[PDB]
Amino acid sequence: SKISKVLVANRGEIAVRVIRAAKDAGLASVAVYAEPDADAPHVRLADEAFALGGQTSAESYLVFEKILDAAEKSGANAIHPGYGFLSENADFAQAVIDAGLIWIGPSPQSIRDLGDKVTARHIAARAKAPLVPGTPDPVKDADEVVAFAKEHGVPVAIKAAFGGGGRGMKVARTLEEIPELFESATREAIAAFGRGECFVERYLDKPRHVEAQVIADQHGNVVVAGTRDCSLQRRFQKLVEEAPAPFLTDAQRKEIHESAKRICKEAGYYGAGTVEYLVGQDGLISFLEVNTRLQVEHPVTEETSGIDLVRQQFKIANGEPLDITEDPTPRGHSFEFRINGEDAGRGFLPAPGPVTKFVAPTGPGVRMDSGVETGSVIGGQFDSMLAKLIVTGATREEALERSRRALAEFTVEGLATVIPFHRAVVSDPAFIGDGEKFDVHTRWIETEWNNTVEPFTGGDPIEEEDTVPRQTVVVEVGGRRLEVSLPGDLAIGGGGGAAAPGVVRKKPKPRKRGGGGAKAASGDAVTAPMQGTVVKVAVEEGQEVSAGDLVVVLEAMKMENPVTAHKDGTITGLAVEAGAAITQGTVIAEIK
């Protein structure tokens, strides 16, 4: 069968991307949106749209029945999962196939095999990919970890067999931390993924993250569209990415290409995917994992190789052989910057808010993939990304120059973003390099970057002078254009004035609690500090707790925030359960 109508089971910039690809290919597009996304750009861009209902992802986009019912009612015959959500759920892939639909992605068996990290390591070893030393099977007890660590010398890392998103890895510097770290990792894996299994391996001191884009075919063909460098990471999640991977010897580049092809063929992988490696300061390459979906970074490879990877996914799903027979030769250099709704001046903590203004750059070598526009609203439910800015040039230096220009032009108002960090990094010498190497690494941002970004405040008046009204006027002085901001109470030339009748000005007070030393201890109520979803309740009615004890965990922007008891006493009046949406100031319980 051939794709005729594609249902995009996702949201935001990726949904818009798949819709545009389907439009190019001539196919019909169905979008599925939750209530918070009732007017997102993809809903209006798609040929038709269906309302899943609900507010959280766990009840709108992560429901097989809702997505499949949308497919049935829209008449769609293919389903594209984008990335995230169900794009790597083998059970969902199998359900899609069983329903008689074309699942645009790898096979369920491939998804399971390459999601099980220990099984992935077995496949890589069988394919003879370069691997960092480590226990080939999950450990039994901290004694095994200590035996490995003593044999191989610290540093070391303990990783869950099914963890992901950067949460499933813990690090040990000294042998004393091995037992406690192992216990913590085991309990965290049990709680979060169900599979309480972990292994250990050597920890690279300052690795680079280099990955290879693979176009794989149902007929057995495999092509490597090109490499990428995503060393700039925040919390083991990428922020800035490059293509092709810079400053690699031909030996390294060839090894990455060949090992990627071998791994895909061993796994039986077909469809677009990526093989992620790590390059240590010593220069050695090590296989890290295989992403079985379209990766967020694909635009840089598209720009540098001229391949439309989403349309390649469509062709592979239709079952045709690849039209590409050899690895493309990269042309130029492309950078990609994620426009997250995160404040770099506040530890990159994401926060919702309105998009009161969104003016993307244009011009030479600039591409914008945005799921946001002026007047959009970012709620607390979904990931914090707003858009992706891709800047391409004839070489790395030209790409950096164009990136400086484009980031200077890019403007967003109403909420915080990481544009100030992008603007700083694209000129930081540690990222420019010396023509043969560069100093960044997977922990460079959080431990080496000089964070000079100020906290976001918007237009809120903070100082006494901020209260005075102002008017901006264009002036010309001998032709030169100027913009002058004039206060409403200005007095110059021995005259002028305003607000005569008993007006006083003082520092405005923040829209926060009164700042009493009790730190909310003046009351018994535990209040939700932000809008979010209760994902875990750590106490029970009548439970006695002490100050600092965990009460609940609230998920906002897909990030977890613990809410803890502020005073000793008995928990009472628990009004929340797992999965309940909660607003700021909502009473969770009372410590009476």
Ligand X SMILES: Nc1ncnc2c1ncn2[C@@H]1O[C@H](COP(=O)(O)OP(=O)(O)OP(=O)(O)O)[C@@H](O)[C@H]1O
Ligand Y SMILES: *C(=O)CCCC[C@@H]1SC[C@@H]2NC(=O)N[C@@H]21
Task: Decide: 453 and 421 in contact? Cβ < 8 Å.
Answer: yes
Segment near ligand X (CB under 6 A), from 34-42, 197-205, 401-409, 509-517? 197-205
For residues 55 and 580, is the Cβ–Cβ distance under 8 A?
Answer: no
Alpha helices in 356-417 (DSSP H): 396-409
276 near ligand X, judged by CB under 6 A: yes
Among 44, 331, 470, 592, binds another protein (CB under 8 A): 470
Considering only 22, 104, 185, 204, the residue that binds ligand X (CB under 6 A) is 204
User: What track of x and - describes contact with ligand Y for positions 294 through 313 (by CB under 6 A)?
Assistant: --x-----------------
Residue 500 touches which of ligand Y, ligand X, another protein, none (CB < 5 to 8 A by kind)? another protein
Q: Which is nearer to ligand X, 68 or 172 (CB)?
A: 172
CA–CA gap between residue 370 and residue 579 (Å, rounded): 29
Distance CA 191, CA 286 (A): 29
Name 533's Cβ contacts closer than 8 Å, sequence gap at least 6. Answer: 56, 58, 381, 554, 555, 556, 579, 580, 581, 582
Q: How far apart are CA 478 and CA 75, in angstroms?
A: 67
Using the rule CB under 6 A, is 237 a contact of ligand Y?
Answer: yes
Do 565 and 572 form a contact (C-beta atoms < 8 A)?
no
CA–CA dist 241, 343 (Å, integer): 19
How far is residue 274's CA from residue 134's CA, in Å, rounded to a whole number? 22
CB of 524 to another protein, least distance (A): 9
Q: Indicate the residue among 394 and 462 with the shorter CB distance to another protein.
A: 462
Question: Is position 282 an interface residue for another protein (rule: CB under 8 A)?
Answer: no
Single-letter code of the amino acid located at 413: E
Measured torsion, CA atoms of residues 428, 431, 433, 438, in degrees rounded to the nearest 10: 140
| Subset of residues 364 to 403 that bind ligand Y, contact rule: CB under 6 A | 382-383
Q: How many residues bind another protein (CB under 8 A)?
A: 68
Helices assigned H by DSSP within 418-468? 419-425, 429-432, 444-447
Work out which of 64, 236, 247, 456 binds ligand X, going by CB under 6 A: 236
Longest dimension (CA), the chain: 87
Q: Candidates 222-230, 277-285, 500-508, 552-560 — which segment interacts with another protein by CB under 8 A?
A: 500-508
- Answer yes or no whether residue 437 interacts with another protein by CB under 8 A: no
Stretch that binds ligand X, among 161-169, 258-266, 352-360, 542-550 (CB under 6 A): 161-169
Tokens 């009351």 -> residue: 523
Task: Specify the residue, 81 or 365, whose C-beta has the smaller distance to ligand Y.
Answer: 81
Q: How far is the CB of 591 from ligand Y (least distance, A)?
A: 34
Could you say which of 83, 193, 236, 456 contacts ligand Y (CB under 6 A)? 83
35-94 binders of ligand X (CB under 6 A): none
Reading phi first (left if > 0) and then psi (alpha if -120 to 50, else beta), residue 57 is in alpha
**Minimum separation from the CB atom of position 408 to ligand Y (A):** 26
Peptide bond into 244 cis (omega under 30): yes
In the bound state with ligand Y, the residue whose beta carbon lies nearer, of 74 and 87, is: 87
* Residue 292 touching ligand X (CB under 6 A): no
- Interface with another protein (CB under 8 A): 353-354, 356, 377, 379, 414-415, 458-461, 463-465, 467-470, 472, 475, 477-478, 480-487, 489-506, 508-514, 522-523, 525, 527, 531, 575, 581-587
- Interface with ligand X (CB under 6 A): 132, 157, 164-166, 169, 201, 203-204, 207, 209, 233, 236, 276, 278, 288-289, 291, 442
